[PDB]
Design a protein around this ligand. Structure first.
Ligand SMILES: Cc1cn([C@H]2C[C@H](O)[C@@H](CO)O2)c(=O)[nH]c1=O
Ligand SMILES: [Zn+2]
Ligand SMILES: [Zn+2]
Length: 507
């Protein structure tokens, strides 16, 4: 039996194509219109195609701010997706909007480790796994959601997360008991976690994932540098091959993995490729393009409103903003201090996971600002003891190896951390910027800082900020609006590296 798995992950409301320089020339990459054309051809040509999405459809552009995933859902229906795993961002607005998205979803939404027993709004709207019939054969699809969702999203008090391994292996047994031996895990745990899980589970031949926004495969463009091969192969406890795949992010890539199974559901052969969604891959479907224009109507003005000009590229790539100093991170934090200068703020902290895109040199539109800061978090002014600021910085670099979003970009201070040291004691130096130059952080002194409400409330593992007993006031200042006010003030934006963060003994 031959099955052709066609998949996407972390589309993050990026329905329009983006622009990248490929082989020495600005090229449009991604877009649902182009995906519709490609999928239509795969649907009528490929052998037993099965379309899947690994989660994180939610959060990323004005299309989400305006439709909360419903615009994406319309396209997912047109794209014939058969199953979708719940990602952490599907919980960003709590159970309410998630239920609205699931109510009417004509594809199977799965996650074996999401315990929603305490949430009536999600009853029967998703399942641990699904059984889909393809070419006369049954294929089981087990979903998994990163347990980190508890800290990185807003699932709320009615949703809990279970161990991926225990949940998945149980699902494998249930499927086998039903006579389904061809099983695929649709995971939102991360590439690294998928590789580890693949060495533990038995009965699973393929793991289609996301969460880490990992680019796998090979491309004819020197500008791209994949993190691994497509697919990546590991051995399970029984010495059998397990294929792990991912398709980068924002619909910029579509994965196509053709797997052949025997009667027992064992892997006989496999071939795959990560398809970069450029004009060469396929044209844009006419009607899908028109449909997107329909959705764009209420937010079109914002997408065209230029509020400033970037004289240099403002770097927002996750491998940068979540691991080292970023000039965009410096700009945003500078803006936070600027907006709250009337409050006497001296330091600004911003988690890199909250900076979602780069701003290439050129015009800066309102639409672009919301792609960079999509959450709608507000600025919170609070007094922190030096010890608390230090603890915050430590939490920020505590998961550097996993490129976690808690990493802190800063303004008003500089810090250096040693990666050869254990998590919790990596920050070796912290100095506050003053008129008389840099002064070592005083762990016993109090400093007025500005952060966003998500981390101020304890999100991203910032329990130290949630537990702070000092002065605390939510300004009500929107993050995006505040950043735009700063950009409008500057008019012509320039931002470079200022040695605010020093990475020592980096692997
Ligand atoms: C839900 C939410 C996530 N985030 C960031 C922090 C996490 O590291 C990351 C998880 O995707 O997104 C915010 O900054 N604000 C929010 O409101
Ligand atoms: Zn994501
Ligand atoms: Zn994710």
């Amino acid at each position: 039996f031959t099955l052709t798995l066609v998949h996407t992950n972390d589309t993050h409301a990026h329905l329009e194509p983006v622009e990248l320089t490929l082989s020495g020339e600005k090229t449009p990459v991604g877009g649902v219109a182009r995906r519709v054309a490609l999928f239509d051809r795969v649907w009528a040509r490929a052998k037993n195609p099965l379309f899947l999405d690994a989660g994180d459809v939610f959060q990323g552009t004005l299309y989400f701010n305006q439709y909360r995933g419903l615009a994406d859902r319309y396209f997912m229906h047109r794209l014939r997706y058969r199953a979708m795993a719940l990602g952490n961002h599907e919980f960003d607005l709590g159970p309410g909007p998630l239920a609205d998205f699931l109510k009417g979803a004509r594809f199977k939404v799965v996650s074996a480790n999401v315990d929603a027993s305490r949430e009536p709004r999600l009853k029967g709207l998703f399942a641990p796994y699904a059984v889909v019939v393809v070419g006369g054969e049954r294929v089981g699809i087990i979903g998994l959601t990163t347990p980190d969702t508890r800290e990185i999203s807003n699932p709320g008090p009615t949703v809990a997360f279970l161990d991926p391994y225990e949940s998945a292996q149980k699902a494998v047994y249930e499927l086998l008991a039903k006579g389904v031996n061809k099983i695929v895990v649709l995971s939102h745990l991360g590439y690294g976690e998928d590789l580890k899980l693949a060495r533990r589970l038995v009965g699973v031949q393929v793991i289609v994932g996301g969460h880490s926004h990992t680019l796998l495969g090979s491309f004819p463009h020197k500008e791209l540098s994949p993190a691994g091969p497509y697919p990546t192969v590991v051995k399970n406890p029984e010495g059998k091959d397990v294929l792990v795949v991912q398709a980068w992010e924002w619909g910029k890539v579509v994965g196509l993995l053709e797997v052949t199974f025997d009667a027992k559901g064992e892997l006989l052969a496999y071939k795959g490729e990560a398809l970069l969604m450029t004009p060469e891959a396929a044209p844009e479907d006419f009607f899908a393009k028109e449909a997107l224009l329909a959705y764009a109507q209420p937010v079109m003005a914002l997408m065209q409103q230029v509020i400033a000009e970037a004289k240099v590229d403002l770097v927002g790539e996750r491998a940068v903003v979540r691991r080292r100093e970023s000039n965009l991170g410096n700009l945003i934090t500078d803006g936070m201090l600027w907006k709250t200068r009337n409050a006497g703020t001296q330091i600004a902290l911003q988690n890199g996971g909250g900076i979602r895109a780069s701003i290439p040199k050129g015009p800066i539109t309102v639409g672009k600002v919301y792609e960079v800061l999509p959450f709608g978090n507000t600025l919170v002014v609070m007094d922190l003891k030096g010890k608390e600021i230090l603890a915050a910085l430590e939490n920020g670099v505590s998961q550097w190896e996993n490129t976690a979003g808690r990493f802190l970009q800063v303004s008003g201070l500089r810090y250096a951390f040693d990666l050869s040291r254990p998590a919790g004691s990596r920050v070796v130096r912290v100095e506050v910027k003053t008129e008389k130059g840099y002064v070592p952080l005083d762990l016993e002194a109090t400093y007025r800082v500005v952060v966003n409400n998500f981390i101020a409330n304890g999100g991203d593992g910032f329990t130290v900020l949630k537990e702070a007993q000092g002065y605390r006031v939510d300004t009500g200042f929107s993050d995006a609006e505040s950043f735009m006010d700063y950009l409008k003030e500057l008019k012509v934006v320039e931002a470079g590296l200022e040695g605010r963060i020093e990475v020592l003994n980096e692997p």
